[PDB]
Amino acid sequence: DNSYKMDYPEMGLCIIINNKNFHKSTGMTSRSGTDVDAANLRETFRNLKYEVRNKNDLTREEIVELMRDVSKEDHSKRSSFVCVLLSHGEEGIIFGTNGPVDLKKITNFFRGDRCRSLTGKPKLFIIQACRGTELDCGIEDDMACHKIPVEADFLYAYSTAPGYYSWRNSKDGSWFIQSLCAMLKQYADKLEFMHILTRVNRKVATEFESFSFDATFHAKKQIPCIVSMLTKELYFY
Amino acid sequence: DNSYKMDYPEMGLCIIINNKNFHKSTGMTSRSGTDVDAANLRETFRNLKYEVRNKNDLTREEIVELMRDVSKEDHSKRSSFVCVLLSHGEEGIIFGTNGPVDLKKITNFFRGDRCRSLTGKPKLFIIQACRGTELDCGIETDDMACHKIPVEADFLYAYSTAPGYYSWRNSKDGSWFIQSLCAMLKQYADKLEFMHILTRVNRKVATEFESFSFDATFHAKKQIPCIVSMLTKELYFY
Ligand SMILES: *[C@@]1(O)C2=NCC(C)(C)CN2c2ccc(S(=O)(=O)N3CCC[C@H]3COc3ccccc3)cc21
Numbered sequence: 181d182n183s184y185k186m187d188y189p190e191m192g193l194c195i196i197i198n199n200k201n202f203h204k205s206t207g208m209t210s211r212s213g214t215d216v217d218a219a220n221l222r223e224t225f226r227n228l229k230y231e232v233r234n235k236n237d238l239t240r241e242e243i244v245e246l247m248r249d250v251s252k253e254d255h256s257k258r259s260s261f262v263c264v265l266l267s268h269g270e271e272g273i274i275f276g277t278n279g280p281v282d283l284k285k286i287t288n289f290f291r292g293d294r295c296r297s298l299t300g301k302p303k304l305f306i307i308q309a310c311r312g313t314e315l316d317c318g319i320e321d322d323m324a325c326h327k328i329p330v331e332a333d334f335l336y337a338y339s340t341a342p343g344y345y346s347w348r349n350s351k352d353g354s355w356f357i358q359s360l361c362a363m364l365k366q367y368a369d370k371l372e373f374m375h376i377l378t379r380v381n382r383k384v385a386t387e388f389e390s391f392s393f394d395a396t397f398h399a400k401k402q403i404p405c406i407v408s409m410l411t412k413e414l415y416f417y
Numbered sequence: 418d419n420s421y422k423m424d425y426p427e428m429g430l431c432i433i434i435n436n437k438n439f440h441k442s443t444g445m446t447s448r449s450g451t452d453v454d455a456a457n458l459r460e461t462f463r464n465l466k467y468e469v470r471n472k473n474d475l476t477r478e479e480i481v482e483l484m485r486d487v488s489k490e491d492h493s494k495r496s497s498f499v500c501v502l503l504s505h506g507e508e509g510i511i512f513g514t515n516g517p518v519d520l521k522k523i524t525n526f527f528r529g530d531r532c533r534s535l536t537g538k539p540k541l542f543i544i545q546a547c548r549g550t551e552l553d554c555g556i557e558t559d560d561m562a563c564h565k566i567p568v569e570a571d572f573l574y575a576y577s578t579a580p581g582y583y584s585w586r587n588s589k590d591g592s593w594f595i596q597s598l599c600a601m602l603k604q605y606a607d608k609l610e611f612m613h614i615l616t617r618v619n620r621k622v623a624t625e626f627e628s629f630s631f632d633a634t635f636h637a638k639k640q641i642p643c644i645v646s647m648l649t650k651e652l653y654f655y
Pocket residue numbers: 267268269270308309310311312313345346347348349391392393394397
């Protein structure tokens with residue numbers, strides 16, 4: 181039909197990978213406020229009736245192993261799958277405590293042909309992480325129904341545009357996760373997911389602007405980036 | 418508010434760049450069926466009240482100059498902007514008849530800070546082109562609020578295919594993506610929000626198309642388009 185079947189016995193798993201402290205050997209800074217994000221996400225998705233699992237400070241190999249193991253579970257009774265990544269990043273990559281991991285490597289475990297119990301079901305990846313270091317200064321023969329693509333039914337909700345910084349507040353957490361949780365709490369029971377994320381886009385874009393004693397980091401702006409390979413509308417109610 | 422203001426005197430420009438024949442120096446083959454796409458789009462957006470401008474076989478230089486020129490027009494009386502790219506490509510790249518153009522280079526002309534008459538208005542880029550050479554084998558079924566906006570805000574990129582992948586085209590019917598896009602626009606433009614129309618495009622391409630080839634390497638392949646939205650509001654064509 182036009183909407184994903186969301187009345188399975190379980191909504192599904194929500195894995196939250198929260199990397200705050202990084203190996204001294206990498207020289208990466210601590211991510212203050214990420215715990216606020218993790219807590220916020222846990223509550224938001226608990227309310228949406230997901231089975232939330234929080235993990236902290238995982239190495240690159242621990243991330244891969246976790247995803248591999250999770251992709252091997254039986255999701256037959258689950259409507260969907262959600263993974264949230266909170267860490268440093270670059271374009272196409274997220275950081276384990278000890279070094280970079282290609283996002284493709286993580287998401288590949290859930291491909292239509294590699295995780296059969298999630299075939300045809302919405303696979304949501306929410307990524308709070310830099311995608312580079314640019315700063316936004318702002319302005320102002322009938323074969324139907326035989327097969328589906330292995331890349332189909334994924335949604336990648338990026339906190340920021342390709343190549344750009346992603347902003348985070350020590351007190352309130354990241355702009356994106358902050359806004360995402362608020363919009364889900366307010367609209368999960370009346371808007372389709374893409375429309376929810378569009379309001380997150382507007383909230384982040386209009387209501388947030390950096391303030392810094394360092395001119396380089398001051399008055400900066402952010403726009404999130406919705407990437408959908410979904411084939412159906414997604415309602416959480 | 419919740420929706421873009423789409424009741425300006427004009428809906429806006431729809432630039433269609435249709436690259437079919439390429440310089441021999443590039444070594445790229447003719448794009449059979451692309452003319453079908455270009456005509457389908459012209460008609461589809463004409464019915465949506467867009468001022469359509471078709472361009473054919475432009476060099477990489479001409480594409481840049483065209484985009485620069487268009488971005489320098491006064492879009493004050495126009496609700497939105499649409500650009501359709503039909504060509505060969507690779508990840509992040511679209512081909513002029515005489516070589517590659519970085520997509521960012523093209524879209525940058527329309528950034529919130531560089532095209533003021535489009536600031537706050539939906540800027541739509543529709544890309545029918547390869548994003549790599551991968552094949553999908555498939556599987557059987559304070560208070561600074563509203564002081565400024567991001568410069569990269571209010572763009573939508575409707576890609577024909579997922580990052581890294583081939584995009585499929587039929588010499589008779591045109592590309593899988595453009596076929597489906599025009600069909601869904603024709604049918605749903607007067608009753609669905611744009612993201613929901615594009616989601617039906619996703620489903621149509623994903624379920625109704627599959628390659629047939631005597632060559633095993635190109636046979637039984639599948640495709641999923643890729644919607645990339647930096648939009649801040651819902652978009653309705655009514
Ligand atoms: C981002 O996720 C990231 N990815 C990898 C790398 C190497 C670029 C490090 N990195 C990073 C560092 C810091 C942040 S942040 O959210 O703390 N934020 C983004 C812009 C810089 C920083 C805030 O800095 C200031 C400085 C002075 C006053 C206020 C804020 C995000 C990421």
